[PDB]
Amino acid sequence: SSSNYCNQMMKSRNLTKDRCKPVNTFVHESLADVQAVCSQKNVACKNGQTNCYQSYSTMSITDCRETGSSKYPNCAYKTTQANKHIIVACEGNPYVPVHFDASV
């Protein structure tokens, strides 16, 4: 875990303090705009449930993926920036995102 954004943020957000998580996606949009996706395009989740929603527009995201040499305690990530549609599973009241299903 070093200075690239992925190594830094994964550690800061308590994802890699006690393990190395293989992949994680960060969304660079306002919280309310991401929560707004729960009332957008309803789609089926990969698991078949129907509480998933796809964003009308693409969103700024950063994909973090472990390199093939990464090993606890020295997790290492490859950082990839992209703009894509996000698909989230929503639940509760208020109806908010609880899982990131995919990115298109």
Partner: peptide
């Protein structure tokens, strides 16, 4: 403790 919504935010949101 941490709710599922809170966890989603800590793990995926970077406004």
């Amino acid at each position: 403790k941490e709710t599922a919504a809170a966890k989603f935010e800590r793990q995926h949101l970077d406004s």
